Subunit: 291 residues, 6 copies
């Protein structure tokens, strides 16, 4: 039966996540709580967004995503709960997840609940939504919420009510689209025949380097598997390799691989060695690619 | 059905916790195991105590708390199993947890099982207890326990029998109050109009600063929300701010907030910035407060 | 209910493990997923092996072990799925796990599923096996597997089918013994009457030192409890103590203990203090022992 | 005998400084070379300036100051050689250096030779000058200067000729005042009645904190010895103490002292303990002071 | 002609030492200033003492030792100036320094000038003294000394007057023996046949380990070259080697050597490898030796 | 008059270098001791060689180079003293050092004294020699040398006698060429049109990267200033730039410069930024260059 997938900035160094889970099991006795991750940089909504955007196609229909970083905790702000539209295919190629031909997911089958602070920006961009509500009903949140713990009060608790079958439309008033806070997503720019983006993430624990340059950005340049690329990082450290599906395509252990990661984005790595860690490469460094 | 909430010093870098879990599912097939945390400083009973004392009000009645750091592993020592009295309200204000008016918890509704080494000191202080037993019966522990793994043998295994409905009074003989080991809890001193305590913890991953000065100590001084405080850390850092419910009350990002944390304790932080990390503030540093 | 115990190198800093879990619940709705650990050094098959070899006796019969580090992801390689023979006793002494006299486990009661890259080397050595198959059927893996995520495609997904009762023999063709990749396990040598091995691991979070010198290597050498030992580490740092069952046997806090760990191997520690961390002792350092 | 006092960014990890010295003795055999320091942050002209501005009153008349960080090495740029006017009193109080009443120094008694890159900015501001020349004559520099070693070619070599009595006016053409490159010296601001500046330096090896708030800024603001001050660092860390002449005035070891350093600037310290190091205080952090 | 050997806690990261030197050349134009070292832990008089006690036999007669760490700077304290008695033999064996049979040094041939804070404790112990004066005359120190720079005002400046031939007896009044401040030197204990001391120092940059167990303590036990020793560090590291004159006597590179250092003290090292650095051995650790 | 340039592995954290200097002034009262450097990695003869090979052309004729790392201290080995032949031009271009056309140095004008352990390998290679002697005479070394301090006994002391005019041929017997120990100098290899060497050094404090690829190696490939080069480091981090005389030729601050350093070797840097430090580039990394 019901699943809550829980992504927070609470860490795993104290009992904070367990407090939320205790309440989730209290409210929805049959629930399964799946940890997404609790290690994001606090208050970094763009990073939290990366951990939650790709999730729906992996989960059983009816799954509730409880997703929180809440620096405006204790203020008059209230969470947003949305039923997304498209589960959405994903991966380097763009497909359903699972055995055989994959598991097709029906539309309108997932709910996200989150602070209304832009955390859901890319979820809404990539999946769309069918309905959105402000979370205000004392049936689903505390009458006297703990000031410093709104992720528990305004996300974990109401997520468990939704998992327990509390009607989404009863959590509070519908929100107009402009009332849902979004963050600005920096565009990949074309610079002659080059594409210019950033390092979006270091892929821990491996030290692979992920960029914000999407497959679609490459397809738009006619760059496909086999293309010899020059990928320049930090505007000083350059790299040369063909675009390949995987790490082993580089040949010898330690050789440079340029590939599409499992999220659909242009990435660079060493084959069975860490690229990022020895050279201290970091998120936010410039990333330029050209054939 | 049954829940075991599991707090240990085992970490999550090998299969130790999984070994305990396997045995829990072996003994109580329908159990749900909830991780509290496994990252405590080993052998620091005062720190372990902080991760378990606030738990009961969050959990369904009948939950068993399996809580362990066991430096006396492999000796003639035996664990203690206690049925607590008051589930106890908590928070900055002192309330039940949950939506609406919160979930009131019945008395005598939770069991803790732990080494008899002081780990349960504050649990017993804040909740009281109705009965306490030494854990000795070969029905609930190994006849030949692994010398170096008493958290598994003397806590995890018998917790699962308890969760499965093994009668608490049958784990072994009743313990008199003086036979339950306690650690000394240093008091918050009165020093004129001031209060003198310590930094109890750095609140990871945020770098908030928690003190052992409780709301009840503040009340003794008549310090309420709105009072302008000087909070001096480490003897030399006279921070000045009013006592506010939350971080955002400090105004601009990075401004100092003095507040009551979600555990009921006087704390200090910066608004959506880390206080402790840039200046390497630490547990054990002195903390003085005055109006 | 069915259990999957999941060991990977995916870490816990993003949604990787949760994607695997989502698919596990999709395929086998009544499953319980137990995390073994996700923190292993990527691509270190010998380390991964250490985290999985001791598991079976702790788990209910029918448990599926999904175990992966997959540096050959996206290649023509296919996973191996084996039903092990002996659940196998373990510990410092060699016993069944659990309360009373322990829980005996029937033969042929556990499946491991893993990359065919040597990860299962010690599992097969210590437990033996009844049957082994290559994992190829589109009924249990994707027809179009994600190139960079074979742990999910070729381990997590099929493990969930096996947990749901998919016949093991139907995953693909039987593998001959020589077709199952092994790593070389470096032997404990004798230099005269000294036993010469290595530091196999630092036991986090404690800083205990584990060697690859097993109880049986000691028995062959005529060393039992009470024997005064000289244990030399890194060909530099000497330590002297009798062989004892546990840490507290050393007397005062900080005193050296030489002992058999819970996995059955010669180890060294300080009593309730860290040995490894102050001296920066490491996995791979030489370890020599003599009576 | 002639003295060259030598300040560079060359460090002391190779033979760089010794190459300069060899040439100094070659050109001026009776010279004494005094190391000022060689550890400055490379290319940080403001830091280099701090190490040289206070020197003249300490040295015998006729001393040549050879002072260099040379990031424009190998370009068409040429060094500037100046004879300063006032030797200038210094210290917390403003006095001549030395025993008795100190050693008065005659005007026009010192030469500085440096890259024309702003290094001499504060030297000229605090001392003034009588004459300034561009260093171009092949009598005092190489006809074929080493491209990457202009500190040696254009500072060390000519300084040795000047020490040996080569007429200053013969090194090259006179420079007009506007032709001498200056850096902007960021002013101490007033925010109401608070003086607002920066941490100018960490005083190694002690971990004292130096600000750019000078004795005269204090005098203008009506602050003298005995005044109770609140000094805030990094817009976060507050400290409170009276202004005192020295560290021991703070009382117990570890107590906060706010003082005028030996260069005449407002500074903060712990009495015989490091302030900066435990709190990781740094150059460039804001510093605010108020009575 | 005259030599001042200068040891301070001033470091070499700014112009502090250069300021002292300028004043030395100002007062005594023909002086040679020799840096002893400037890198001592500030305020650690025992460490400063180790850098100056072995000096006299290496220097020409008439050398002045200017030696300073001055945490009491700016108080009513005044330096002490002493003419030592015995230049004293030194080394592992106890000999004069130099070629041939060494350079015998006359008695009463060296002056030390230092804060009266215990810095000269071991100088006076090992050399004795013939006369001692408080440094007060405005002929040799500033009438208005810089409060925060007493090493310059009360040591460097008067050292230069002394080097210039200013009569020692004229610096101020004679001091009685009890007026010369000393630090306590912990003894090397006899413990059965064993000797119990400490690690006095890590010998940088090699990472050799020096003890406070002197050749004369070894002689008391009849421990000579060739004796097989157990040297235990930090309480738990029973190193075993014969006492040898030098490192290479240990044989293979990396082997343990136990030796008498160039200062006369029992020490331990590896042959052409670092002992202290890999295992983070430290000053203050216990050191026990027995045959 | 006489100069001794002193290069050792003694560091500057204690009085070791000062002990040697004391003796140098004792033996040769008129001497000037110039520090080359004391910070080399102990026992690394190849590194020590780099700090001393380029020195002669900078120093007055008659200069004695006292150069030591002595891991065979206390053994029967004895130092070598050589009169070199060619002073040798140097730099990126190959010229005399100094003002005007530079200072031409006569042949046979410099002596090196060093352990006979290969330290002088490159000195002898680049300068040649006219005579070489084993240093054994009790007129120039101690009759009873300190076992652990042969750099003082067998280098510093006899260097001072040579500076004082002791006849070189009287220090001991002449050495045949094969009796002078040399280290192996790895060749730069041609790999098609590429040159393959190593990173010889990180140029501290700047973080420039120096290779063992000489100007002559470039001239041999017809690579001159202006040539577009691809310089690959560590076999993964590549770089592209024209060969230029200096850093500023790169344009903007932070741009990659490929140049000939002041020692004559192909090097790579960022313009007024550190290359090595952010990417943790190190000595011993591969360096490949191609036009
Ligand atoms: C050794 S740990 C068990 C997990 C370990 N990774 C293993 O596989 O054996 C078990 C218990 O021993 C205690 N322990 C661990 N190291 C210890 C030490 N050096 N001294 C005393 N107790 C220790 C811990 O607090 C814990 O309660
Ligand atoms: C304080 S944390 C609650 C867990 C905490 N360990 C506890 O036991 O109370 C709750 C929320 O506060 C936010 N938060 C934490 N520290 C903050 C700070 N200094 N400023 C703004 N928000 C903060 C976090 O993002 C999180 O969403
Ligand atoms: C890339 S990780 C998948 C999780 C990743 N964070 C993601 O979202 O795509 C999948 C498998 O690839 C392997 N892997 C990761 N980096 C690798 C590299 N640089 N070379 C070879 N294999 C690698 C890992 O061992 C793991 O089994
Ligand atoms: C290269 S350093 C000379 C010493 C060096 N160790 C050598 O032997 O060649 C000479 C001058 O170049 C400057 N310099 C060094 N690295 C630089 C860089 N990457 N960009 C600009 N200037 C630099 C320094 O400031 C210094 O003044
Ligand atoms: C401040 S240092 C002088 C050099 C400093 N860089 C300057 O320019 O003023 C002078 C003396 O003060 C002492 N000193 C430095 N910091 C101190 C502190 N925080 N407390 C007590 N003494 C200190 C040192 O031991 C030294 O003897
Ligand atoms: C011991 S150091 C002398 C300085 C030392 N700080 C002292 O006061 O005695 C003298 C010589 O010993 C060599 N040395 C130092 N430690 C060594 C070791 N562990 N093995 C071999 N040689 C060593 C060094 O290279 C140096 O040339
Ligand atoms: Cl929260
Ligand atoms: Cl345990
Ligand atoms: Cl994977
Ligand atoms: Cl330079
Ligand atoms: Cl001083
Ligand atoms: Cl030496």
């Amino acid at each position: 039966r019901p699943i809550i997938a829980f992504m927070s900035d609470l860490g795993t160094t104290d009992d904070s996540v367990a407090q939320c889970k205790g309440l989730m099991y209290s409210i929805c006795p049959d629930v399964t709580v799946v940890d997404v991750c609790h290690s994001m940089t606090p208050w970094d909504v763009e990073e939290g967004a990366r951990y939650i955007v790709d999730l729906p196609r992996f989960f059983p229909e009816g799954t509730v995503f409880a997703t929180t970083t809440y620096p405006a905790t204790g203020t008059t702000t209230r969470s947003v709960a949305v039923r997304i539209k498209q589960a959405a295919k994903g991966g380097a190629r763009g497909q359903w997840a699972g055995s055989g031909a994959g598991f097709e997911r029906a539309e309108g089958s997932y709910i996200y609940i989150a602070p209304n602070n832009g955390l859901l920006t890319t979820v809404l961009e990539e999946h769309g939504y069918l309905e959105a509500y402000e979370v205000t009903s004392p049936k689903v949140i505390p009458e006297q919420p703990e000031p410093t713990f709104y992720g528990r009060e305004m996300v974990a608790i109401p997520s468990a009510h939704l998992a327990a079958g509390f009607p989404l439309s009863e959590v509070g008033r519908p929100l107009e689209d402009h009332e849902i806070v979004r963050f600005n997503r920096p565009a990949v720019e074309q610079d002659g025949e080059a594409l210019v983006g950033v390092v979006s993430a270091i892929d821990h624990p491996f030290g692979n380097v992920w960029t914000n340059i999407h497959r679609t950005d490459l397809e738009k340049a006619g760059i496909g598997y086999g293309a010899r690329l020059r990928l320049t990082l930090d505007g000083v450290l350059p790299f040369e390799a063909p675009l390949t599906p995987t790490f082993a395509d580089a040949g010898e252990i330690g050789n440079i691989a340029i590939y599409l990661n499992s999220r659909g984005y242009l990435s660079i790595a060493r084959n069975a060695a860490s690229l990022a860690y020895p050279y201290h490469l970091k998120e936010g460094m410039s990333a330029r690619v050209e054939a």
